[PDB]
Design a protein around this nucleic acid. Structure first.
Lengths: 175, 117, 159, 186, 166
RNA sequence: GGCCGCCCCUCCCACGGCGCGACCGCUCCGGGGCGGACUGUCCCCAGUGCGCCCCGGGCGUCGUCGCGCCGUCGGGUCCC
RNA sequence: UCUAGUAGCUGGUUCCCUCCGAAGUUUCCCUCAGGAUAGCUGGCGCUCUCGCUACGCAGUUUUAUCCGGUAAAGCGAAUGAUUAGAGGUCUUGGGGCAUCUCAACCUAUUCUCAAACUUUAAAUGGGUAAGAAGCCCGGCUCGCUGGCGUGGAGCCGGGCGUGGAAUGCGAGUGCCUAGUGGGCCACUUUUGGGAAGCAGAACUGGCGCUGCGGGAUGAACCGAACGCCGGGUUAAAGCGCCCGAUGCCGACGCUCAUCAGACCCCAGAAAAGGUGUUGGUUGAUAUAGACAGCAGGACCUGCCGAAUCAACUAGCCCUGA
RNA sequence: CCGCGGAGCCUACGCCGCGACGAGUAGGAGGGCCGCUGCGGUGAGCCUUGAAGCCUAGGGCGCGGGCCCGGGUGGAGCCGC
RNA sequence: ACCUGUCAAACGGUAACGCAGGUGUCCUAAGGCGAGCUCAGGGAGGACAGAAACCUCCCGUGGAGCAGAAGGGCAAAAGCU
RNA sequence: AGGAGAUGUCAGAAAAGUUACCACAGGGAUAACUGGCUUGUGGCGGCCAAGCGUUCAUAGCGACGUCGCUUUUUGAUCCUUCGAUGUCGGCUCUUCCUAUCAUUGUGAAGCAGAAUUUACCAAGCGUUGGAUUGUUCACCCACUAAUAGGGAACGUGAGC
RNA sequence: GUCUACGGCCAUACCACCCUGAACGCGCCCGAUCUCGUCUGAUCUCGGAAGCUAAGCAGGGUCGGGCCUGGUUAGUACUUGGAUGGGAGACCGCCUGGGAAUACCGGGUGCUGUAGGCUU
């Protein structure tokens, strides 16, 4: 699949009732997809490789977006994923700091593409949970667990180039 | 010197240009190939169908008389002219809008809408 | 090029099924074929007489002639962009009745009788077949049991 | 877009290929009748006025008598878009009202001597503008020699079609392929 | 669980160059002989399996009441005596469809939307819609919708596409 | 004239939920007495299912029948 | 002079517009640079069909019902091929010496295989059917068949329209008929060959016959197919400048190359390596005290006093070049 | 009927309306008020007050094949249907 | 000019101086019909007799044979007499 | 009318060779050069490390295997050229490549010195005179710092 | 509850071994004058009725082999259709649909038609 800024979808589905089984079990997954159409397709991708349930023999009982409970609270997220490299498949655990669960997962897709050239179709995200500051393991995330965090902004690149595009004064980047 | 040997390329495209037409079906087909001893009897059966024409006519006439009696035993009903429906507004308005059955009711309604008469 | 032999490439299509060789069961000779009924052609290698050609194996046609041991069949054959109705004589062992026609004749019967029942009962009944309609709206009860949460499993390199 | 154009133009006669001004006047008359009248008789007559001579075979007097003697055909006008020819194998001619483009002289004499009436298509329009009380007849369209040569080829098994033969005799296409004693006979 | 939809709107999104014979046949059975032509399709197992054949060539979904309204009102034409005639008066609908009870543009919209009896006649009366190019562009015509593309079944997003092509 | 606008009400229907009984079908984690087979603890032993036979419990997609109670910008040309 | 000799071979073959529009394949031929033949094309029609002040058909699906031995799988299932131990023993077996080990055979297992093997067995395939030419009653004919009022077929009357899946479409048919009968390319499948821009096949699409936007350029790629124009919008592809369009205060990272890298077909690189840098996996040490470093005894200690060590994996960059 | 009157039309091989479509080698067909030479009819045609032919920075028509007119030269025939 | 298996992509068709092979015959029976039998191989026994002579019992789904190559087919058979 | 005597090039002419004395119509539908694809073969490299090297896998080599590069070998193919692209070698002359023989600057050794071998930057400069052979190739004689290898339509015939 | 004669489907019916079999029947059984055929009345053919369920045959049994059927294998292997997906390649991932086969683990071990008996 592709990505925009992903949302979290709770998708609940089941098999169609059969004379053998009148009340088949309900199954729930949390799927991170750009839209609900992609979410339902991703649900059938996983549940078919787990529970032997195809779309033609089942139905989507429910599909709704899961809103973030504390979008104004900064959190640490652990992501458990598996991805296919050019030679082999691997299991990875990663950390991100974000305000929303979906945003952390979008960070992970960007970071997998940046560091491993992994495309979204080659990634399976199996667990995303909020981690306390004491249980974080990556130094990149741990350095922001400091109640007196304080740093300057050293060398600010002039981003408003071309606005004059021709000026007498050379830009100052100290601020 | 050497050339291509065989291909069926572009052949299916040629066939479908005028269509793969199924053979025509006729109600009567050829008796060609069926058992000659069976043909000989069927011709003899057809040859002598003229005999028993009197019995066929008498039996057919009796059936015609019997079915005529059955028709007489039944009476063709006559319906009534449809009237203005009461309940459903759409049904009532479709009746008024009918060019034939609504002609008289429309005249009365129009005569009622006249102002300063 | 390859040969024009009559039984070239019939190594498996004219072989008997596994543990089904030997004497031909006698009810195949007792099946009764009238003029006008539809038969499936399936060559049997146990009987080498009256054997249909390989291009008619798996084909379906209708009986136009009945003889002492064989049946004439009008079978459609596709030849280089035209379909022609061939007439072939096949012994009884290599044919059997086609069940598609039997199903349709049954449906005609239940249709006619349902018309008679509907007219006598003053009701209207559906007689045309319809394609599988979209599933109707319904409720799904949870029975106080939460749906089980599925999750992709970690990768493991087996032997 | 995504269509075929090889059958867009229908091939049919929309006017007579003839330059005969008298036929062109009847075409003018029956073009008006086919348009301003709901009769399908006037439409059929208009089509046959366009048609070629091979498509307007002569109608024998004997065959018209045959077709006008069928029950319910009494006191009806036989209409032929074509020529009415005389049959010498018929000895008694009843009274017939026949409309035709052409009638041979001997046919016209026999019809008139019997008490019948011959009409042209302009008098048929005046008498029956709709085509009421008519029997629309046609000559045998495949009753000419070219159709004995058409169809399945002569040298093909179950073909009874006449070959193109310069002269007829024992020495002209009778040996090999027409005889089991000379090669084969299919 | 709501009833799965009975109505689909199908837009051809591909050209006529290099189409396989089976896909070509299904497209002319759907009356999508031109790119950006659209039509309503009644959904059942017969039609759905037809739409699976032509999946890379079409973008379809479930239209809403506004979609069926704008399509019929703005560029809805009738097939009157094998001619493409604009639906300017209700008389054109009544002369061709009045025997079934469809006498106005509102009846034809109700007939298409709440698909039931006589949907075959009402829909075949409508000439295949000639939609414009999608204003704002497309994502990827050669890839399925669930992969960031254009093709296949965008179930409810078809109404966004209709706003941009109609 | 009619409908909708706020209050005791009023009937029917539809959907969902909660209980109460009756009926039916499967089941034993079951009890009691009638015949057959099984065990190297076989005479004093110990089990295993099967027929009629009625009580006890469960399930039936949450079966059928009704009875109540709760919800609906629910439906009945907005029931009376 | 016969003689303008014959040529399946090379060259040429003169005005405009409009409409339709191919083939390089089958079979036969002293046939392979050629013909005849079917196919593909055009022209002329004709027979019907629907509608306003349906005769039927289909490069499609569905619903039923048959057909098959390729992909896969199997070899403690048959035919072949084949590795290793184990438990028993008749041994026209051998060796070292009453013998005992090997070999042989048998039995239960085990490793690895098959285009010309198979119990099993797909996906995609192919055939048929989805009614008025039907269904149901009554009668007649027969020299065929026959225990029979038998059976089968034919023929004559009568009754029954809820027109018996979806979708789309107007069909049928005759004559005459030119060119062509060197092909080539691509996804997938596939034979020979180390391989080839090599040779040979299947299916579909394409080039040839075809221009247009993009791939700088290009027969075949991607997009899309074309009467002459105005407005608007897109596809594939793009938006530093050449060159239309990011002169966005675009988002997150990765990467420095003394041969950097920079977009389908496509136009150049492999095994193996790096203590370059970035992620990730597994294991281990460390308060009794980690790893460093300062030395001694000869793996232990005291002094500094918190993270460290190893193996592997995969991104960009580098060596291989 | 206090007005005595009322546009155009319909070379029917003509005129008018509506809808869809338009690539093309080899090849097929249709139309040509495209062009050349001669013949039968016809234009009470043209021409020494200037035919044919030729030249042209002139005016134009037709999608095109081509054509008409102006000007110059020329000196005896030429064209339309 | 023919035939078998494979190629060949589970209907049919499908190419190469692709692969593995066969044919220009043979049979008065090895054609036709009927009857009666069961074949290859193995185990255990019996004078000469032994790894292979002949006799007997048992097991034997065909693992034999059916003239030609191969594939299919076949057991009170299509095999033997 | 039915059998038979046969055409195996098996839809069925009645048929030996040579041409370097040759001819015509054609063919790049097709060979003999270059060039282009390919690189089996040729040539040149790399990886692993069983051994060799007194001792010692890796100074220097490198078996069993395995990955590449080049087009100065020969093949394979038939895309271009058969109404003509003059053909082997030598002679003459220029330029280019480096996979370096020497010379400049270095690193390593089983580098004591001398001599030699291995590797790096590196093609600026140089790489000869003769006997035999038509020869490319080869071989020998003799000098030398060395007597390295190649390309440019297998460079170069209106230059011989 | 069973059998016999003739069968249909051809193992859920076969194979190995053990137990039981009332009554009819089916057999084993006794014999060679006739019919018939043999080296041999063993088989085949014929005439019987002293004995016997030992055998055939039937029913049952076996943590039985096989066979049938279902789980598992497994949404695995494979595969229709798609992309200017990845990868130097070999090949691999995803979208859209279909979807197997051993080993391994359970359950079952003939149903039945026509005619005629026994179970009195």
């Amino acid at each position: 699949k592709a990505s925009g800024t992903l949302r979290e979808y709770k998708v609940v589905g089941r098999c169609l009732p059969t004379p053998k089984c009148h009340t088949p079990p309900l199954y729930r997954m949390r799927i991170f997809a750009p839209n609900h159409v992609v979410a339902k397709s991703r649900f059938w991708y996983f549940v078919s490789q787990l529970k032997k349930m195809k779309k033609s023999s089942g139905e989507i009982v429910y599909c709704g977006q899961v809103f973030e409970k504390s979008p104004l609270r900064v959190k640490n997220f652990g992501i458990w994923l598996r991805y296919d490299s050019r030679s082999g498949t691997h299991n990875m655990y990663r950390e991100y700091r974000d305000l929303t669960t979906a945003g952390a997962v979008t960070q992970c897709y960007r970071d997998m593409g940046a560091r491993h050239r992994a495309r979204a179709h080659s990634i399976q995200i199996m667990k995303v949970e909020e981690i306390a500051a004491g249980k974080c393991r990556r130094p990149a995330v741990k350095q922001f667990h400091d109640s007196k965090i304080k740093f300057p902004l050293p060398h600010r690149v002039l981003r408003r180039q071309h606005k004059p595009r021709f000026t007498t004064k050379r830009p100052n980047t100290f601020f | 010197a050497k050339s291509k040997n065989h291909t069926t390329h572009n052949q299916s495209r040629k066939w479908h240009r005028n269509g793969i037409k199924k053979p025509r079906s006729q109600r009567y087909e050829s008796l060609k190939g069926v058992d000659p001893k069976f043909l000989r009897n069927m011709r003899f059966a057809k040859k002598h169908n003229k005999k028993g024409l009197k019995k066929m006519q008498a039996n057919n006439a009796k059936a015609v008389s019997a079915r005529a009696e059955a028709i007489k035993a039944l009476v063709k009903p006559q319906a009534i002219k449809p009237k203005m429906p009461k309940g459903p507004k759409l049904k009532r308005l479709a009746f008024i809008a009918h060019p034939k059955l609504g002609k008289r009711i429309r005249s009365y309604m129009a005569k009622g809408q006249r102002l300063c008469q | 090029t390859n040969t024009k032999g009559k039984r070239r490439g019939t190594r498996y299509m004219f072989s008997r099924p596994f543990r089904k060789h030997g004497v031909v069961p006698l009810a195949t000779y007792m099946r009764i074929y009238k003029k006008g009924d539809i038969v499936d052609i399936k060559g049997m290698g146990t009987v080498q007489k009256g054997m249909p050609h390989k291009c008619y194996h798996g084909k379906t046609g209708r009986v136009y002639n009945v003889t002492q041991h064989a049946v004439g069949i009008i079978v459609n054959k596709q030849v280089k962009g035209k379909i022609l109705a061939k007439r072939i004589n096949v012994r009884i062992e290599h044919i059997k009745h086609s069940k598609s026609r039997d199903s349709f004749l049954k449906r005609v019967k239940e249709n006619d009788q349902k018309k008679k029942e509907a007219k006598e009962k003053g009701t209207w009944v559906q007689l045309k077949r319809q394609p599988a309609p979209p599933r109707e709206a319904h409720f799904v009860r949870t029975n106080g049991k939460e749906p089980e949460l599925l999750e992709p499993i970690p990768y493991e390199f087996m032997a | 877009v995504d269509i075929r154009h090889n059958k867009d133009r229908k091939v049919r006669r929309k006017e007579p290929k003839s330059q005969d001004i008298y036929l062109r006047l009847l075409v003018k008359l029956y073009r008006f009748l086919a348009r301003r009248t709901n009769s399908t008789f006037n439409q059929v007559v208009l089509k046959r006025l366009f048609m070629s001579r091979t498509n307007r075979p002569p109608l024998s007097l004997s065959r018209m008598i045959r077709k006008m003697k069928l029950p319910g055909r009494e006191n009806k006008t036989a209409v032929v878009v074509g020529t009415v020819t005389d049959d010498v194998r018929i000895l008694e001619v009843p009274k017939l009202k026949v409309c035709a483009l052409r009638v041979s002289s001997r046919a016209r004499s026999r019809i008139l001597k019997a008490g019948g009436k011959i009409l042209t298509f302009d008098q048929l329009a005046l008498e029956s503008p709709k085509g009421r009380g008519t029997v629309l007849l046609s000559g045998p369209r495949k009753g000419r020699e070219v159709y004995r040569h058409f169809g399945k080829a002569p040298g093909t098994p179950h073909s009874h079609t006449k070959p193109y033969v310069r002269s007829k005799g024992r020495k002209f296409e009778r040996a090999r392929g027409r005889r089991a004693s000379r090669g084969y006979k299919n | 669980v709501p009833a799965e939809p009975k109505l689909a709107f199908v837009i051809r999104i591909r050209g006529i160059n290099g189409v396989s014979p089976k896909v070509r046949k299904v497209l002319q059975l759907l009356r999508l002989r031109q790119i950006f032509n659209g039509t309503f399709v009644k959904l059942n197992k017969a039609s759905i399996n037809m739409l699976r054949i032509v999946e890379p060539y079409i973008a379809w979904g479930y239209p809403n009441l506004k979609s069926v309204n704008e399509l019929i009102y703005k560029r809805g034409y009738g097939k009157i005596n094998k001619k493409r005639i604009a639906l300017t008066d209700n008389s054109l609908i009544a002369r061709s469809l009045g025997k079934f009870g469809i006498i106005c543009m509102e009846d034809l919209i109700h007939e298409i939307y709440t698909v039931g009896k006589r949907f075959k006649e009402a829909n075949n009366f409508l000439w295949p819609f000639k939609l414009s190019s999608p204003r704002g562009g497309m994502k990827k015509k050669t890839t399925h919708f669930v992969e960031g593309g254009d093709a296949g079944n965008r179930e409810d997003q078809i109404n966004r596409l209709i706003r941009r092509m109609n």
